[PDB]
Design a protein around this ligand. Sequence first.
Ligand SMILES: O=c1[nH]cnc2c1ncn2[C@@H]1O[C@H](COP(=O)(O)O)[C@@H](O)[C@H]1O
Ligand SMILES: O=c1[nH]cnc2c1ncn2[C@@H]1O[C@H](COP(=O)(O)O)[C@@H](O)[C@H]1O
Ligand SMILES: O=c1[nH]cnc2c1ncn2[C@@H]1O[C@H](COP(=O)(O)O)[C@@H](O)[C@H]1O
Ligand SMILES: O=c1[nH]cnc2c1ncn2[C@@H]1O[C@H](COP(=O)(O)O)[C@@H](O)[C@H]1O
Ligand SMILES: O=c1[nH]cnc2c1ncn2[C@@H]1O[C@H](COP(=O)(O)O)[C@@H](O)[C@H]1O
Lengths: 53, 349, 349, 349, 349
Amino acid sequence: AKALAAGASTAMLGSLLAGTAESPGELIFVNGKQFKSYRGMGSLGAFQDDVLS
Amino acid sequence: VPVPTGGDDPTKVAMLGLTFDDVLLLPAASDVVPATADTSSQLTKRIRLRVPLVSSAMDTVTESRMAIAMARAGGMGVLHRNLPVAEQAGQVETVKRSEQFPLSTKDSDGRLLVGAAVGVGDDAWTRAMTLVDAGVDVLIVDTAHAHNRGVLDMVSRLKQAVGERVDVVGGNVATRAAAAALVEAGADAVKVGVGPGSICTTRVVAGVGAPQITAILEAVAACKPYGVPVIADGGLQYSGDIAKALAAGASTAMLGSLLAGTAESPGELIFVNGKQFKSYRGMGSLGAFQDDVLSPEGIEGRVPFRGPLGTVIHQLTGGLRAAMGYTGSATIEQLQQAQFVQITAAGLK
Amino acid sequence: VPVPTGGDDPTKVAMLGLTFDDVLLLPAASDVVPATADTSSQLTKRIRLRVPLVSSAMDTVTESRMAIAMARAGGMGVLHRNLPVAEQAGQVETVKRSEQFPLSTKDSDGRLLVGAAVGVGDDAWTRAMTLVDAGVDVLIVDTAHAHNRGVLDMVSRLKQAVGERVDVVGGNVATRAAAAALVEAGADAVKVGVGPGSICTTRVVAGVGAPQITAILEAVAACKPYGVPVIADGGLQYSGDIAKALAAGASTAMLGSLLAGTAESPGELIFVNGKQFKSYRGMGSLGAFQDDVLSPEGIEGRVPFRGPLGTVIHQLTGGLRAAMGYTGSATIEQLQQAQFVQITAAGLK
Amino acid sequence: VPVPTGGDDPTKVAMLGLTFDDVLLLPAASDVVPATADTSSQLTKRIRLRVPLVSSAMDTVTESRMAIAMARAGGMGVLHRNLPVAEQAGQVETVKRSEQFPLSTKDSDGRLLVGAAVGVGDDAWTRAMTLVDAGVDVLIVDTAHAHNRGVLDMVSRLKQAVGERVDVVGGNVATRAAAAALVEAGADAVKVGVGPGSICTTRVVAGVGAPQITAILEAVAACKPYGVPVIADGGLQYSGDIAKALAAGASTAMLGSLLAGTAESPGELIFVNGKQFKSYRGMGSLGAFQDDVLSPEGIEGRVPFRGPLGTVIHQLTGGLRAAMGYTGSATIEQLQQAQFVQITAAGLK
Amino acid sequence: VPVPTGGDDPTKVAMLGLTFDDVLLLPAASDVVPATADTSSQLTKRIRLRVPLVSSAMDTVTESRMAIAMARAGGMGVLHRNLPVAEQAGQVETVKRSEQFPLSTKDSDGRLLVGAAVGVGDDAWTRAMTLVDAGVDVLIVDTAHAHNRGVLDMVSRLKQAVGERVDVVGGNVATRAAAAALVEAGADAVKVGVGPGSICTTRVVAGVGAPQITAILEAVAACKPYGVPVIADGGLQYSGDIAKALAAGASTAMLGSLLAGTAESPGELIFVNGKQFKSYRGMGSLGAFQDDVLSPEGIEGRVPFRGPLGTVIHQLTGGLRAAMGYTGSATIEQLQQAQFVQITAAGLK
Ligand SMILES: O=c1[nH]cnc2c1ncn2[C@@H]1O[C@H](COP(=O)(O)O)[C@@H](O)[C@H]1O
Ligand SMILES: O=c1[nH]cnc2c1ncn2[C@@H]1O[C@H](COP(=O)(O)O)[C@@H](O)[C@H]1O
Ligand SMILES: O=c1[nH]cnc2c1ncn2[C@@H]1O[C@H](COP(=O)(O)O)[C@@H](O)[C@H]1O
Ligand SMILES: O=c1[nH]cnc2c1ncn2[C@@H]1O[C@H](COP(=O)(O)O)[C@@H](O)[C@H]1O
Ligand SMILES: O=c1[nH]cnc2c1ncn2[C@@H]1O[C@H](COP(=O)(O)O)[C@@H](O)[C@H]1O
C-alpha cells in the first residue's frame, strides 16, 4: 500500500511468493516444520552474465 | 538366613520384572524372506486378523473413522465407551454399514469387523445388549483391574447370554492368577497390562504396576494351555516393542499413542509454532460414563501429527516382518517361541 | 573361593538395599472399593489414627497451626524442639485448647492429640517433664542414630516415669538390631530411617545410609512379634511411596517436604518471578537447642506453595485408597501383607 | 517353581549380554614394554596383519584411497559393493597397482592386499568371479544375518571354486550356533555382530540384537577349536573398546565411524559454522545394488573431520599397546587370554 | 552348561567390581562421640599419622608449601618428581628445616615428616640416594602398574640399601596377587588403585581399570596378615568416600583434586568471569622426568579455588568423625571392620 501510494503502479514480489506451493523447488522438512529454498540471482549457488548481480 | 533384600519372608518380593527395554531378540537359523512372512494371528478363539494390531478403546483414539481404517488395514478397532449408549450403537452401525484393501477383516456377511468396550454394572449390561443388537463382533469388558469378582461375574453373564453370537475379552490383568481366573470365567481373550508405562500415573499415584514382559510371560503361562489368546495392552513405543511382545507369547498388540496422532483419530488438528499436534488423554485423566473406580490416574498431552493411518500400520508391519526374518519365524506361532537376551543398563545409553 | 565382590568375608557387604523406586505393588484378587477402604492404623500401641500420616518434627514443618490441622485431618503432628522449653509447652497448650472434621483424632476428653520431640540429656529430661505437665500425648526421643546407649537409657527412663500417661517413640534406626534394642528398652513405637534420601547429606558427608524399603523390612522383622508399630520417616515423595512404605510393614508414615509448602506450615510466603515458594531446611543444616551430635549434615532450600493442608492430605489418602483397591486390602493390616515386584533400571526412565 | 523373570521356561531368556561398557581389563603380572608389544594378528587362516584393524565395507568409509592407506598402515581395507561390478573391479585393480611404510601388508608378489564384499545370489556370483579375476585377496560374504541357508551355500560354493586362490569370510553372526555353521560351511574367518550399537536401528525397528562382548565370547567358543579367526564388527568407539574386543577372543577389529571422518574416506568435506564434518550413512539407510533383504534399518549423519588416517591408526595402536602393557601380553594371542572385571551402573557415570 | 555371560570359561569374567557409589556404611551399636573419635592411623609400619590423609605426588598438588601445610594439619605430603633431582632435594630440605599445630607429624628430632616419589631406573636410584641424603622420611616407588618385575626389584634394592633409615612404599596395584608380590618384595606400605575414576583416561584409552572398593578389599586381603598398611589412591570425591575407603580396609587415603584448588598448592591463581580457579593435570597428561611407560593417559583442567588447606582438612576430618560416630568406631582399626550395604541404581539418582 505504501509503494502504490508513493506513485508506483505495480509491485513486484519476491520472498512473499517463494514459499508458496506454486513456486519451484522441493519442499524441505526440518524438525516438524516446512520450508522452501530462496536464493538471490547474485548468490554463489545461483547464464547469469550480469556483472553487478 | 534372612532374605538378602531384607526381612525373613522369601516371597515378600515376588519376582524381578523385565520391561521391553531389558530384552532383545536373539537371531536364529532363518530361512524366511521378510516379504513373505505370514503375520496373521488370532485375536480371539474364533477371530483371526491379517495384521496383529488392535486400536485402543480410548476417546481420543478409536471412533468410526479409525475403526473403519483399522479394519481395512488388516487389524480391528475397539470403539470407546465415554459417550451415551445410543451414540456408541450408532458408531457400531456406521462401521458395519461401511480391490484397494486385500487385507480387510470381514465377517461371514462381508462387513468389516468391529469391537466395543463395556464396563461393569446394570447400565453396562444395557449397553452391551444394545451393542450386540447393533451388530458388534466382540465385547471387551474394559476395567483397570480385572481380578475383581464383579468383572469375572460380568464376563460369565455375557458369555451365558450372547456367548455364541459375539466374543468376550477380559479386562487388564498382570498376574498368572488373574489370567487363570479370567480363563475360568469364560473369556475368549485376555488383555494384559497394569501400569505398563515407565512413569505411568498408576505407578506414581498408587505405586502399583507390573513390567510388561514379565506380565505377558505369566499371563501366557496361564492362558496358553487352554488356547486363550493374549492382547498386550500398553507400553509399546516402536515396532521392536511389538515384536518383543509377540515373542513373549502375546497373540495381539493393542496400540494407543502410536495411533493418536494419525489423521483417522478424532480431535481437531492443532497448530503450534509451525508444527502440528493432536490431543491425547487417558480415560483416567482429569479432563476425560467413566464409572471405572480405578481409571486422577492419567494425564493429558499432545502428540505430533503423523499422517494417514496406513503409513504407520505399514511401518509397524515392516518392523515386525524384519524381526520375523531375523528370528526365522514363518508365522506368529513360531515367533512366539523365540528366545530373549537380557541387557544391562550399559546397553540402554 | 573368595567373595565375588572382593575379599574373603562374605558378610563384609551385608545385604542389597532396595529403595522406593526399586519396587512396585503387584495387583491381587481385589473385592475392595477404594471409597470404602479403611485407612486407620496404629501410631503407637495405644493410639489409632484415622489417617496413617504424621507431620515431621521440623522447625519449618510442624508448629501449633500445622499440628491442629493434622489432628483435624485425621493424623497427628509432632512439634519440633528448636526453641525454648516454655515456648514448646505453649505450643502444646495452644494445640490442646483448640461436624466439619469427622476424622479428627481426640483423646478421651475430646481434645486434639499432639506429640512433642525431645533430645537426650538432663535438659531434655526437664523439657520432657514440662511437656508432660503441659498435657502432651506422645514423646518422640528424636535422635539421628538411636542405637546409642544414652538414647535407650532415656527411653527406659521416660517409660519408667510417664510410661502410663503418655507414649514413648524411639529415634531413627535402620537395622534389625537397633529396632530390637529399642523394643527391649520399652518404646511404644519405632521410627525408621537413617539417610533415606537418594542424595541425603549423611550419604555424601558421612557415607552412611540405608535404603528405606530394606530398613523398613528389617525393622518390622524385629518389631512385629511384639506388636510395636513402625513409623517410616523420610524419603517419601508421592502417595505411591506411602503405599509402598505401608505395604512393607510400616504402620505409619511421617511426612516432611510434602507438607512444608502448605499454608499451615510456619514461615513467610516468598515470591520469586511470579511464583510462590516457602523455605525448607533440615535440623542439621548450618542455618538451623539442636544438641544432636549427628544432626553441617543438611541443606536449605525452597519448595513451591501448595495451598491448604487438607487438599494435600486428601490427595495422598486418595492415592493410598487406590493402592488398597488394586491390592485388594480392606484394611491397613491387609495392605501390610501385599507383595512387591522388583524392577530394573530400564523401568525407571 | 517358575522362572524369577516370569514364566515356566528357564530358556526363554537365554543369557545376560555384556557390552563393551560393562567390562574392564584387569591388570596382571607384566614384563612388557608398550613400545615392544607385538600387535600382529591373524585376519584369516592364511593372512596375518601387522595392525589388527580392518576398514568397514561401507560406501562412506572404504574406497581405493582408504584401502591403500589401510594397507600401508599395517591393516587392510574391504571395498564396499554399493556400485556396479566393473567399478568395484576397477577399484581392486587400482589398489593392486599402487621405506615410509615398514608395516605395509603385501602378497607374495609385493602388492598391497585388498578385500572385497559380495552378496548372495547369481549377480553376487558374477561379481565375485569378476573380483577374483581382478586380483582380489579376500572375499567377504557381507550379509546382515549370516545364519541363512543361502549365505552358507554361497560360502561353500566360493570355497569350492576359488578357495585356494582367495580367502572367504562369513557374514555377520551373533550366536555360537551361527558361528559353528559358518565354520562348517568352510569360512576362513567369521565376522561377529548383529545390532551391536547401543541405539542401533535394528534394535529399535526390529527389536533384534546382541551385546558385543557376549557375542564375541560365544563365537570364539565355537571358532577357536578349529583355528578360525574372529572379526569383531561394530560398536567400537575408543581404543579401549578395541582392546576389550581383542581380549574377548577376537583376532581382528573392523572399524566404521572411527575411520569415516578421516581424509582418506570418500565424500566431500563439509563446513558448518567454522567446523569440518563428513557424511556417514549405513548401508541400510534410505539414502543408501544393496540387494540385502535385512539391510530403513539405518540412519544418516555427519562426523567431525579427523585428519590423516595415520594419526588415528597410531592413536588406536598406542591405546592397544598400553592395554597390552597393563595386561602383560607380549602378543595378541596372549592378550586373548586376559581376564575381565564387570562393573555396575555406578561406574558408568 | 556354559557361563550365562557367554563362553565356557567361568573365570573369563573374574569378579563384579564395586565402586564408592555402590556401597553405604551401615549404622551399628555406637557409644562414640564424634568429637572424641581417634582418627590416628598407620601410614607405614613405623609411621603413625594423627590425620589419615596424604597429599598426592602431583606437580599441581604437593610442593614444599603444601607438604609443610599437610604435615602441620596432621597428615603428610609426598613431593612430586616432575623436576630435577637437585630441586627435589632442595624441596625436601626446605620442608625439613621449617602451639598452633598440636596434630603436626614430626620425627624424633622435632622436624616435620616428608615423603618423596621416585621412579624406576638408575637415574631413579641416584634420585633416591640424593633424597635419602637430604633427609627424606619415606620413598614412594610411584609407578602406574607396580606388578612389573623392575618395580619389585627396585623396591627390594631400596629396602636392602636404606631400608632401616627410611620407609619404602610400593606403586599402584589393583589385585591381590600384585599386593602379595609387593609384600614379598619388602614394601612397608602398598598404594592401591589403577584407573579408579569413573571416566579415567586409562579406562577409555586402554580399557584397563579396577573399581576401587573391590581393589581395596583384595589388596587388604593380601596385605593385612603381614601388617602392611594400604593407601587408597584415587577416586575420592567426598569425605564419605574417605570413610568408605577406610572402612574397606585401607589405612590411609591419598588426595588429589580435593587439595589442588587450595591456596597451599602450587600454580598461579586464575580469574574467570569473577570466579577463581587453579590448574590441575595428571602426570600422564600431554602438558606434563616422567619416565613412566604406562603413565596421553591423562587430562588437564581447572578446579575452583577453595582457600586455605586447613579448612578443607577440617571438613574432611569432620565427615570422617561423623562416619565413625555412626558406625560406633572408637579408632580407625575399629572402622576397618564396619559393614557395607549395596545400593541399586535407583538409589543413585
Ligand atoms: O541476487 C540478488 N541480489 C540483489 N537483488 C536481487 C537478487 N536477485 C534478485 N534481486 C532483486 O531483488 C528483489 C528482491 O525481492 P524481495 O525478496 O521481495 O525483496 C527481486 O525481486 C529482484 O528484483
Ligand atoms: O488414563 C489412563 N491410565 C492408565 N491406562 C490407561 C489410561 N487410558 C487408557 N489406558 C490404557 O493404557 C493403554 C496405553 O497405551 P499406549 O499409550 O500405547 O501404551 C491404553 O491403550 C489403555 O488400554
Ligand atoms: O538436617 C537433617 N538431616 C537429615 N535428616 C533430617 C534432617 N532434618 C530432618 N531430618 C529427618 O529426615 C526426614 C526427611 O523427610 P522428607 O523430606 O519427607 O524425606 C525428616 O522428616 C526428619 O525425620
Ligand atoms: O545400515 C546399517 N545398519 C546396521 N549395521 C550397519 C549398517 N551399515 C553398516 N553396518 C555395520 O555396522 C558397523 C558399524 O560400525 P561402527 O559405526 O564402527 O560401529 C559397520 O562397520 C557395518 O559392519
Ligand atoms: O596422568 C595421570 N593418569 C592417571 N592417574 C594419575 C595421573 N596423575 C596422577 N594419577 C594418580 O591418580 C590419582 C588421582 O587422584 P584424585 O584426582 O584425587 O582421584 C593421583 O593422586 C595419582 O595417584
